[PDB]
Structure formats: structure tokens, C-alpha cells
Design a protein around this ligand. Structure first.
Ligand SMILES: [Ca+2]
Ligand SMILES: [Ca+2]
Lengths: 197, 197
């Protein structure tokens, strides 16, 4: 009834895995992607798939009920999706350019921390929502890119609240039981950086 | 109660003008933008503002009720928002490069025509929806960019159905009464092309 055409490394595919397990939806994971196929009908683009999952299985909501709060959630999701030019530079740049790219990524994450997260445990408050799911790539995927490139970005000293969020997110049992193996993910990131020089 | 911080040329600001007039919402237009301010609270990004307007004033819906149909509408909106690298080239490129950029824009519009519009009068069926509004920049703004650059993109011969859609959209009384003056818009596009060489 529900098929997920994805991969074992893509953070975009894992956003869908999380949202489906948060709704209790059974699916067959078939390893561009991701493409969710529900009753033979396909939905592409992880952000479009997430809103489809939220509307199709409304129990245990992953977006707030208030329209202003929903607009703020979509604003932060769009903000993360737009700021990908800074993250690409972590796979291409080397030396002094790489340290400038890492500082740019930190400034992007700082806006998210100050204006999006604030003092909440999660972007969704006391539990994860679609905003947390959309920023989940900043946990073990960003950690792997940092190690493969030799640069530090998400540190407790420079981003105290976002660093504490990233630990809390990765420790959520649903997330902990559904993430790539770090060793395999790091080797994948090293290979991607090698390809893009 | 509702303020719109915008401009007289931005197609992104006009998407908001249309959606507000389709809902019968009175507002003060104050001429980055657009920023809708509702009860002192600001919402930025035209696509985030459109979903906020649709949720806040649910009468005369601008999105379908079915989740699969809503996902398809959001997919096409995201598709138009992503394919902006082809449209930028119409302001920068010259000669043989400009004709190659115009053909790339045509291929982007052809996918939209075949898979998004099909045989419907509008992307929303018998009346305009948020998909039509999001593609409204392909009407008089694209016409102005074509004239300022000396290239043809949306022609009846190469895009028969999308060309007929663009005429139908621009003739909708709500749109006809709420678009920039073509002379002023063309002079703005000529100036933007001059700036970007
Ligand atoms: Ca870290
Ligand atoms: Ca034309």
C-alpha cells in the first residue's frame, strides 16, 4: 500500500522514514529519490512528501494547528532548504576557503538557533515536528561532512542551544533506531568530497 | 489589520495581492519584500504567505481538498520556484548563449504544460488556484523579459496550451485589474538587464 523508493545514505529519504514511523505507517523500503508511492500514486520531493504524510495521517500531528505557527514552521523549513549553497562548499573548498565556508554555515545555523529554536527542547516544542525532521541532516550527516573535510561547524561553544538540540534529536528512540551506520556514512561523505575535489 | 510591504514591480508581491483580493481581504499596500503583517505579526516568503492566506481565510479555497491533489499542487509550485537558474540567464546571456537559455526555459515550461496544466483551463481547473498564482510571473513579467532581451520563449507555436493559459490568466478580471503597467515593467526589465550586462 505504501512504498518508499530511497537509499541508505540520503538524509532526504530518512526524513520520510521518520515521518512514516511517527505516524505508525507500514511501508516497503525499496533501496532521483525519495519517491513515496501510496496506492500506486507517486509523490516526489521530501518536503512535499512530509506535508502529504501529515495530511493523509493526521493523528499525532507534525505541524501546529495555528496558521501563524504553521507559517513560521514552513518559513524555517524553506530557510534550511535555501541555505544549501553554504553546505556544498564543505565538499568542494580546501584550506582557507574551507574555513570561511564553515564560518558561513555557522552563521546560517545561528539564525536557526536564535530565531527558530530559541529555548525550546525541539523546533516542535516538547516533541519533534516537521521542522526537526527537516533539520535532522544537521545531526549525523553534518558530523560526517565535518570529519571528512577537517572542519568544525556545530560545536557546543559556538552554538550551545543547537548543539544541545542535535544531541537530543539523535537520542530520540525513533531517530536513534533509524539513522545510517556512522562508519558507512562517513566513508560515503569522504567519497563524495574526493569526487568534488 | 493587514499590511503588505511590497513593491510595484515584484511578481512575488503581486502573488500576495492576488491571493488577498481572491479572499476579499482588505489591506494597506506599503510600497527584502514581500512581507505580510497581520495583526502586527510578520510573514515573509510569498509561498509561505500564500499558504498562510489559504489557512487564515479558508472561504473560496485556493488549494484542493484531497491530499494527493494538494501534494501535486505543492510539487508544481516547488518546481517553478526551483527552475529560476534558467530565467536568470535571460538577463545575463547575449547572442548564442541567450538563445540556448531561452530554449532551456521553453523545456522547463513544456514539462509544466504537459504534466501540470494538461487540458485544464487553469492549473486549478475551471478557476485560478495557488499554482496559477505562483506561475503568474510567466505572463506579463516574462513578456517584458523577452522584449528587453530580444528572445522568444512563450509562443503559441511551441507551447500551445501554456500560451492559451497565459492569455486566459491575464484576462481574468482580478488579474487584469491588478498587474503592473506594461510600459513601466518593460523599462524596469531593460534596466535590470543593463545592470547584469
Ligand atoms: Ca558537533
Ligand atoms: Ca508570448
Amino acid at each position: 500500500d505504501v512504498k518508499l523508493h530511497g537509499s541508505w545514505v540520503s538524509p532526504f529519504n530518512y526524513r520520510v522514514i521518520w515521518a512514516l514511523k511517527l505516524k505508525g505507517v507500514e511501508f516497503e523500503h525499496i533501496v532521483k529519490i525519495p519517491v513515496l508511492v501510496h496506492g500506486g500514486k507517486p509523490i516526489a520531493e521530501s518536503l512535499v512528501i512530509l506535508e502529504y504524510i501529515e495530511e493523509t495521517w493526521p493523528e499525532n500531528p507534525l505541524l501546529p494547528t495555528d496558521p501563524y505557527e504553521r507559517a513560521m514552521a514552513r518559513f524555517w523549513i524553506q530557510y534550511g532548504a535555501t541555505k544549501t549553497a553554504a553546505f556544498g562548499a564543505l565538499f568542494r573548498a580546501s584550506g582557507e576557503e574551507l574555513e570561511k565556508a564553515a564560518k558561513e554555515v555557522v552563521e546560517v545555523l545561528r539564525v536557526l538557533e536564535e530565531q527558530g529554536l530559541g529555548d525550546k527542547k525541539f523546533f516542535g516544542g516538547d516533541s519533534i515536528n516537521l521542522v526537526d525532521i527537516s533539520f535532522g541532516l544537521f545531526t549525523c550527516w553534518l558530523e560526517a561532512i565535518e570529519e571528512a573535510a577537517g572542519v568544525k561547524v556545530l560545536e557546543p561553544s559556538t552554538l550551545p542551544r543547537l548543539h544541545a538540540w542535535a544531541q537530543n534529536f539523535i537520542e530520540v528512540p525513533l531517530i536513534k533506531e533509524n539513522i545510517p551506520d556512522y562508519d558507512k556514512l562517513l566513508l560515503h561523505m569522504k567519497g563524495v568530497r574526493e569526487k568534488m575535489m
